Amino acid sequence: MYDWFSEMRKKDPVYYDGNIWQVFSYRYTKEVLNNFSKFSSDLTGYHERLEDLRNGKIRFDIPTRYTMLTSDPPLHDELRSMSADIFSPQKLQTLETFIRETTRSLLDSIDPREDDIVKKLAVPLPIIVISKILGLPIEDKEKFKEWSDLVAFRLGKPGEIFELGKKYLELIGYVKDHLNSGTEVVSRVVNSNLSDIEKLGYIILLLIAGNETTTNLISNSVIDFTRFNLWQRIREENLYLKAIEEALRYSPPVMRTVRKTKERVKLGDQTIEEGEYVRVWIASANRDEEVFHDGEKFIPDRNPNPHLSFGSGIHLCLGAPLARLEARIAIEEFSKRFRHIEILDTEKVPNEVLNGYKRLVVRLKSN
Ligand code: HEM
Ligand SMILES: Brc1ccc(-c2c[nH]cn2)cc1
Incomplete structure (x- = not known):
């Protein structure tokens, strides 16, 4: 992946393959994300369907x-x-x-x-x-894991990030059953003037959409700290904050996102027609040498680090504070608890947008 990213950043940062546009550089990725009025997120006809x-x-x-x-x-x-x-x-x-x-x-x-x-x-x-935050009880741990795993890139269904089917219908039934038992933010949604369809969507987004991405940050951090041998330095130079930010930059849980043009626009040397999909490669932008010095190197005290792993602009990840907090605490506690780590076996998440681990088998020495 990343060698290809370097090639595109050098020769073709804004690339049309005869179907969609792909952006590989930091400057144009950030431009796209922040220009909400030309680069739209409404890929599902939400505005058109609102009334x-x-x-x-x-x-x-x-x-x-x-x-x-x-x-x-x-x-x-x-x-x-x-x-x-x-x-x-x-x-x-x-x-x-x-x-x-x-x-x-x-x-x-x-x-x-x-x-x-x-x-x-x-x-x-x-x-x-998240269950604590939303006041929505984990009745079946296994169902919640399966629901969390519904999240995926869905080819040919732009904007859709959920695998549907019987599991998805069970999720819906679950949310309907606990509508009125939640914390105050859930009550806000339920008592609003949103349609029932929107209310379900909103709750499901908060409850489920952030689980695997946060899981992936934690897994990727463990992998990155181990492979580059940073556990002691991080522990002793107290680099938790900046190390996790560098894991975010280096191993983004979300590799990319997408927009649709509302009008003819110019991005660098190129002209993109109206109604075109523009895929924006966060992972490649995060290594743009013009912004990050020695971009291919993992530097645990990297500064500055304006990475795009939570996006940029008005859609900047709602869960970013929470994901940063959980990850920091997980790593801190893990680091305090264990002296030595060996990675015995790994299984990656196999699909396109999410970047993380299904399995991370390790041998540890505790203190
Ligand atoms: C390491 C963990 C996470 C990463 C890397 C991540 C990444 C992202 C990215 C890149 C976006 C922007 C998508 C776009 O611009 O189209 C986003 C948006 C969003 N994320 Fe996350 N996310 C994480 C955790 C979470 C968590 C824990 C939650 C919820 C509890 C969450 C909920 C959301 C929501 C609701 C949005 C939409 C914000 C909006 O449209 O205004 N994310 N996230
Ligand atoms: Br595919 C896919 C893309 C982005 C998600 C950002 C996602 N979740 C929370 N923040 C999840 C799945």
Whole structure:
């Protein structure tokens, strides 16, 4: 991947293959993400469908097509304003003790002789925390893991990031069943003037959409710290903050995102017609030598680090404060708890957009 990224950054940072456009450089990736009025996120016809969702002309549709992720202002801003305070660093910091205690309890379960830390640590932690945050109970741990795994790039369905089918219908039933038992942010959504379809979409987005990405950050951090032999230096030079930021830059859990042009636009030397998909490679931008000195090197105290792994602009990841907090606490506690790590076996996430591990089997020496 990354050698190809370098080639495109050098010869062809803005590339048309006869179907869609792909962007590989930092400057044009950032330009795309921030220019919401020319590069639209409404890939599912949310704006076009809004009135008939709300007046009930549209009776049946896929709830997760219609969330803030696939909308433009003002609809986007109005949606996000209902939960933006909950996910701010100021408000999340209350949760620090709960997350730290949950982490150490997950660490307890680890057989240091041989264990899968994706299965023991990285997968359960985001699910437990978001369930706490939303007041939506984990009734079946296995169902919640399966629901979290529904998240995927979906070829030919732009904007759609959920695998559908029987599992998805079960998720919907679950949310309907616990609508009225949630915390205050859930109540905001439920009591709003959104259509039922939008309400379901919104709740599912918050409950499920962030689990695997956060799991992937934790897994990728463990891999990166181990492979480049940084555990001691990070521990002793207290580099947790900047090291996790560098893991974000170097091993982005979300490799790319996409936009659709609202009008003819110019991006660098190229002219993109209206109604074109523009895929923006976060992973490649994150190594742009014009922005990051020695971009191919993992530097645990890297500074500055304006990486695009949470995006940029108005859609800048709502969960970024939360993901940073969980990851930092997970790594800190893990680092405090174990002296030595050997990677015994790995299985990557196999598909296009998500970058992380299905299995991470390690041998550890505890203190
Ligand atoms: C390491 C973990 C994570 C990474 C790398 C990540 C990445 C991203 C990226 C790149 C975007 C922008 C997509 C775009 O511009 O089209 C985004 C948006 C979003 N993310 Fe995350 N994310 C993470 C964790 C989370 C978590 C934990 C949650 C929820 C609890 C979450 C919820 C959202 C939401 C709701 C949006 C839409 C924001 C909007 O449209 O205004 N993410 N994320
Ligand atoms: Br495919 C895919 C792309 C982005 C997600 C950002 C995602 N989740 C939370 N923030 C999830 C799946």
